[PDB]
From Swiss-Prot:
<feature type="binding site">
    <location>
        <position position="153"/>
    </location>
    <ligand>
        <name>hydrogencarbonate</name>
    </ligand>
</feature>
<feature type="binding site">
    <location>
        <position position="130"/>
    </location>
    <ligand>
        <name>ATP</name>
    </ligand>
</feature>
<feature type="binding site">
    <location>
        <position position="41"/>
    </location>
    <ligand>
        <name>Mg(2+) 1</name>
    </ligand>
</feature>
<feature type="binding site">
    <location>
        <position position="41"/>
    </location>
    <ligand>
        <name>Mg(2+) 2</name>
    </ligand>
</feature>
<feature type="domain" description="Guanylate cyclase 2">
    <location>
        <begin position="279"/>
        <end position="404"/>
    </location>
</feature>
<feature type="binding site">
    <location>
        <position position="93"/>
    </location>
    <ligand>
        <name>Mg(2+) 2</name>
    </ligand>
</feature>
<feature type="binding site">
    <location>
        <position position="42"/>
    </location>
    <ligand>
        <name>Mg(2+) 2</name>
    </ligand>
</feature>
<feature type="binding site">
    <location>
        <position position="323"/>
    </location>
    <ligand>
        <name>hydrogencarbonate</name>
    </ligand>
</feature>
<feature type="binding site">
    <location>
        <position position="89"/>
    </location>
    <ligand>
        <name>hydrogencarbonate</name>
    </ligand>
</feature>
<feature type="binding site">
    <location>
        <position position="93"/>
    </location>
    <ligand>
        <name>ATP</name>
    </ligand>
</feature>
<feature type="binding site">
    <location>
        <begin position="398"/>
        <end position="402"/>
    </location>
    <ligand>
        <name>ATP</name>
    </ligand>
</feature>
<feature type="domain" description="Guanylate cyclase 1">
    <location>
        <begin position="36"/>
        <end position="165"/>
    </location>
</feature>
<comment type="function">
    <text>Catalyzes the formation of the signaling molecule cAMP. May function as sensor that mediates responses to changes in cellular bicarbonate and CO(2) levels. Has a critical role in mammalian spermatogenesis by producing the cAMP which regulates cAMP-responsive nuclear factors indispensable for sperm maturation in the epididymis. Induces capacitation, the maturational process that sperm undergo prior to fertilization. Involved in ciliary beat regulation.</text>
</comment>
<feature type="binding site">
    <location>
        <position position="162"/>
    </location>
    <ligand>
        <name>hydrogencarbonate</name>
    </ligand>
</feature>
<feature type="binding site">
    <location>
        <begin position="41"/>
        <end position="46"/>
    </location>
    <ligand>
        <name>ATP</name>
    </ligand>
</feature>
<comment type="similarity">
    <text>Belongs to the adenylyl cyclase class-4/guanylyl cyclase family.</text>
</comment>
<feature type="binding site">
    <location>
        <position position="93"/>
    </location>
    <ligand>
        <name>Mg(2+) 1</name>
    </ligand>
</feature>
Length: 454
């Protein structure tokens, strides 16, 4: 069986949630289901990024970093896939995976996912990982325009895996409160986590008669897309997709144009692994605690329509979209493949301010915050051959992310963006520098005030 079609190469960049969805063209589009989520924090392994920028790597730092990082992440991805998971998205610091099932099967799948999580830690018993698990209701949001599409999962099961991850330490498996409540406590030995109703898994000791492989095989019964039969030894059913112009047209909207060029063998397959000077514009849109996914969807859609319009003008791109802690964040990048300018900084700031001004007027968005940072970041396709994504990794990515969270409601920028801007100083305001999560000394940070006092 030949399987190297463009449609298959595109499907590699997407989860089954998208590849085998059959939903409408209306945007936003929303859907609701239940499942188990797994969040694998892979920092410590992506904190090395600074080492590989050193002159010791003789201008092959990016290539060496992508190689060693994919060595490890692809092993994590194989475990997830073999246990029936769907990897939803990659980021420099983590990956999120989903086991979507009927509510009545959540109990058994949690055991599958816990076994998976511990086999993942088993891969690193000679850097390590941190794993959070959650279970419950999940809402999916698809937004975009006629040429591009983005998706998110939303809900407290998503927020649950957020906090479960934040509590974890190296080699931990933390289960959200609702996951612990729905899990098979007959099999899962836990321990308290102080002043937190979430729990840490110590052992998975099953009944004497329990045979996991038979148990897993029965669980695959409810996994709609687990490879089986003649395809039992494929990691993804996506690998079997055949040409379908209508499906490919839909799928390619989720994929960055430069990726598609490479997919089409119109660009060298290594062109996108690089250490590149870029400007990160990290946009956060916050909604109120009580806001529900059917009201958030339209707000994100309206914000997105304007965001993409401004980025096209100032020649930026959306690398990633996330949502947790009731905030939807856009990881935007300027100076990405091909399109780099020496006025990129003023454009990034002006684009930020434009996005700040519009989005603050979108209703149901309570707060807009944008962090801007410029510097060298690693760019590359990260993951497994059969499931990977273009991602950016580096100090300035994390800095932009921290700035938008620690300085809400304004546009902030780093000392690099400030000095290099083709703009005068009174356009800015030096900020009180706060102590931020896992951040080296910033340098001075600034608020982009804009051209007016008003
Ligand atoms: C700031 N970033 C550098 C780190 C952010 O955390 C991620 O790395 C990250 C996230 C966000 C997230 C969501 C819930 C719990 C923890 C983290 C997602 C993600 C994917 C999808 Cl489909 N839907 C939503 N809502 N989120 N995927 N990844 C890889």
């Amino acid at each position: 069986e030949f399987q190297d079609w463009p449609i298959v190469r595109i499907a590699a960049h997407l989860p089954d949630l998208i590849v085998y969805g059959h939903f409408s063209p209306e945007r936003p589009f929303m859907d609701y289901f239940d499942g188990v989520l797994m969040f694998v924090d892979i920092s410590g392994f992506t904190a090395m990024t600074e080492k590989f920028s050193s002159a010791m790597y003789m201008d092959r730092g990016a290539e060496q970093l992508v190689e060693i990082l994919n060595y490890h992440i692809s092993a994590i991805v194989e475990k997830v896939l073999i246990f029936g998971g769907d990897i939803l998205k990659f980021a420099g610091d983590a990956l999120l995976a989903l086991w979507r099932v009927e509510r009545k099967q959540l109990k058994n799948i949690i055991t599958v996912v816990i076994k998976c999580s511990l086999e993942i830690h088993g891969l690193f018993e000679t850097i390590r990982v941190k794993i959070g698990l959650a279970a419950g209701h999940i809402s999916m949001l698809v937004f975009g325009d006629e040429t591009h599409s983005h998706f998110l999962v939303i809900g407290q099961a998503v927020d649950d895996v957020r906090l479960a991850q934040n509590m974890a330490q190296m080699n931990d498996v933390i289960l959200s409160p609702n996951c612990w409540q729905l899990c098979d406590r007959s099999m899962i030995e836990i321990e308290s986590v102080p002043d937190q109703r979430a729990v840490k898994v110590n052992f998975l000791k099953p009944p004497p008669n329990f045979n996991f492989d038979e148990f897993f095989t029965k669980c695959t019964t409810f996994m709609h897309y687990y490879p089986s039969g003649e395809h039992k030894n494929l990691l993804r059913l996506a690998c079997t997709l055949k040409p379908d112009p209508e499906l490919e047209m839909s799928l390619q909207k989720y994929v960055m144009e430069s990726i598609l060029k490479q997919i089409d063998n119109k660009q060298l397959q290594g062109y996108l692994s690089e250490l590149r000077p870029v400007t990160i514009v990290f946009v956060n849109l916050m909604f109120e605690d009580q806001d529900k996914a059917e009201e958030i969807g339209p707000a994100i859609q309206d914000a997105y329509m304007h965001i993409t319009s401004v980025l096209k003008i100032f020649q930026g791109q959306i690398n990633k979209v996330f949502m947790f802690d009731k905030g939807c964040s856009f990881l935007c990048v300027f100076g990405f493949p091909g399109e780099k300018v020496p006025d990129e900084l003023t454009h990034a700031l002006e684009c930020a301010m434009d996005i700040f001004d519009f989005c603050s007027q979108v209703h149901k968005i309570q707060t807009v915050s944008i962090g801007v940072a410029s510097g060298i970041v690693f760019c590359g396709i990260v993951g497994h051959t059969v499931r990977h994504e273009y991602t950016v990794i580096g100090q300035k990515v994390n800095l932009a992310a921290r700035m938008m969270m620690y300085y809400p409601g304004i546009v902030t920028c780093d000392s690099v963006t400030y000095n290099g801007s083709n703009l005068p100083a009174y356009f800015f305001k030096e900020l009180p520098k706060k102590v931020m999560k896992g951040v080296a000394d910033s340098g001075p940070l600034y608020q982009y005030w804009g051209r007016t006092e008003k």
